[PDB]
Amino acid sequence: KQYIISEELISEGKWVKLEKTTYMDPTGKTRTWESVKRTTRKQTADGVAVIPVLQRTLHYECIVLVKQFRPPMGGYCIEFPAGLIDDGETPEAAALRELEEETGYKGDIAECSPAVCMDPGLSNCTIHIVTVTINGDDAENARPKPKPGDGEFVEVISLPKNDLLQRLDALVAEEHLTVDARVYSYALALKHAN
Amino acid sequence: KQYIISEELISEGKWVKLEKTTYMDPTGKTRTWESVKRTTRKEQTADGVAVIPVLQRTLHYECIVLVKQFRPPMGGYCIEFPAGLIDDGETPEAAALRELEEETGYKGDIAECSPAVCMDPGLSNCTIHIVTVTINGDDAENARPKPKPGDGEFVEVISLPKNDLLQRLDALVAEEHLTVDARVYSYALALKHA
Numbered sequence: 081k082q083y084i085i086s087e088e089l090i091s092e093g094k095w096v097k098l099e100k101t102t103y104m105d106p107t108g109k110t111r112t113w114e115s116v117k118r119t120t121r122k123q124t125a126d127g128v129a130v131i132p133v134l135q136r137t138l139h140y141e142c143i144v145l146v147k148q149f150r151p152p153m154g155g156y157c158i159e160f161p162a163g164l165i166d167d168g169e170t171p172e173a174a175a176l177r178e179l180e181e182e183t184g185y186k187g188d189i190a191e192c193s194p195a196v197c198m199d200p201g202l203s204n205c206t207i208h209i210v211t212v213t214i215n216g217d218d219a220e221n222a223r224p225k226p227k228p229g230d231g232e233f234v235e236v237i238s239l240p241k242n243d244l245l246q247r248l249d250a251l252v253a254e255e256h257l258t259v260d261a262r263v264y265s266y267a268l269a270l271k272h273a274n
Numbered sequence: 275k276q277y278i279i280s281e282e283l284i285s286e287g288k289w290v291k292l293e294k295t296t297y298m299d300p301t302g303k304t305r306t307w308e309s310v311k312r313t314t315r316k317e318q319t320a321d322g323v324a325v326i327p328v329l330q331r332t333l334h335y336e337c338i339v340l341v342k343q344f345r346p347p348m349g350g351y352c353i354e355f356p357a358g359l360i361d362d363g364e365t366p367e368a369a370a371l372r373e374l375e376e377e378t379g380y381k382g383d384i385a386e387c388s389p390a391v392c393m394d395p396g397l398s399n400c401t402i403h404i405v406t407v408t409i410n411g412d413d414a415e416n417a418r419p420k421p422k423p424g425d426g427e428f429v430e431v432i433s434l435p436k437n438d439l440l441q442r443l444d445a446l447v448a449e450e451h452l453t454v455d456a457r458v459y460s461y462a463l464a465l466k467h468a
């Protein structure tokens with residue numbers, strides 16, 4: 081019933097643009113929305129986010145997260161490792177590449193979501209969520225070598241999966257950070273399960 | 275180590291603005307970013323809420339109540355947690371219970387409320403509280419629940435069993451063009467992984 085009539089460019093930056101979207105509401109009344117898009121997309125999705133499950137025998141299973149200064153937020157954020165998909169890169173390949181660059185871990189693909197939306201009332205941005213396991217007992221993951229590209233400055237934080245939500249809440253209390261909504265949602269469901 | 279140096283307005287709409295952000299990198303080098311922000315944030319601890327609504331009924335499996343709506347930024351239908359912006363002076367909890375009733379008809383009971391969490395922190399400063407609400411589906415109030423959508427809100431309610439959430443989302447995505455929200459997907463994935 082609903083659909084886009086037209087899109088007017090408001091402002092285009094290098095990396096982001098702002099549009100005025102004209103759409104038909106279900107009643108046949110025309111309405112407008114203000115919408116954000118990235119200028120970088122081709123591709124399945126703008127990006128990937130990796131859920132990295134670090135598995136070491138005789139240890140609690142951990143979820144590997146990253147902490148970074150985020151200029152839009154004006155502060156530090158705790159997130160899944162993540163980046164944009166290169167032109168002609170598959171989402172699986174982007175996940176393994178970003179996971180290594182940001183954490184130094186080398187992982188295996190467990191599963192890969194369809195394109196999911198980041199903030200659909202605001203932007204068209206989408207990602208694929210990629211669950212990856214990291215055999216933490218392999219030699220290649222003994223001393224994880226992170227390969228940060230230009231301007232990336234990433235701290236790695238591994239938290240136990242079985243208490244993820246209490247651990248995150250504790251970092252927020254102590255360290256003045258913003259947890260990512262996807263990280264939080266995952267953590268919540270771990271507790272809400274069963 | 276890192277901090278904001280300046281925020282230069284590039285373009286302001288009615289609802290969203292684009293900024294040129296200048297920040298200090300941890301090597302002591304000045305860099306720039308492009309940042310999205312809403313124009314509607316006041317003294318709220320976040321822009322918005324999203325509601326995790328757990329529908330509970332005797333002799334039923336627990337459902338997660340979701341909503342499907344057309345999203346002009348995406349140009350299509352999206353399946354999401356019930357959500358909306360927090361009104362000036364309104365608490366995140368009150369906003370959650372109000373949005374849940376408006377969008378689904380249900381009258382919930384607060385269970386938990388997250389700290390403010392970031393929606394897409396490499397892009398925007400937008401934040402929400404994730405509010406877990408239980409719905410007593412045996413209460414007569416929640417028997418024949420009628421949405422009270424505000425002007426231009428057009429919302430369908432989709433209740434799915436918690437114990438099969440990911441597969442049930444996959445089956446909806448198999449049957450039409452629709453995008454699942456990344457927070458919904460993260461939550462469904464954790465329900466599987468636990």
Ligand SMILES: Cc1nc(C(=O)N2CCCC2)c(C)s1
Nearest residue numbers: 113114115201202289290359
């Ligand atoms: C980025 C956008 N957000 C909204 C929105 O959700 N609004 C609901 C209350 C005021 C505006 C647009 C109408 S455009």
Ligand SMILES: Cc1nc(C(=O)N2CCCC2)c(C)s1
Nearest residue numbers: 095096120164307308396397
């Ligand atoms: C909204 C923005 N996103 C990025 C980003 O993550 N980029 C990674 C490759 C292209 C730029 C900015 C540098 S500004």
Ligand SMILES: [Cl-]
Nearest residue numbers: 133190211467
């Ligand atoms: Cl797993």
Ligand SMILES: [Mg+2]
Nearest residue numbers: 161162163182
């Ligand atoms: Mg990244």
Ligand SMILES: [Mg+2]
Nearest residue numbers: 162163178181
């Ligand atoms: Mg990276």
Ligand SMILES: [Mg+2]
Nearest residue numbers: 356357358377
């Ligand atoms: Mg809403």
Ligand SMILES: [Mg+2]
Nearest residue numbers: 357358373376
């Ligand atoms: Mg609403």
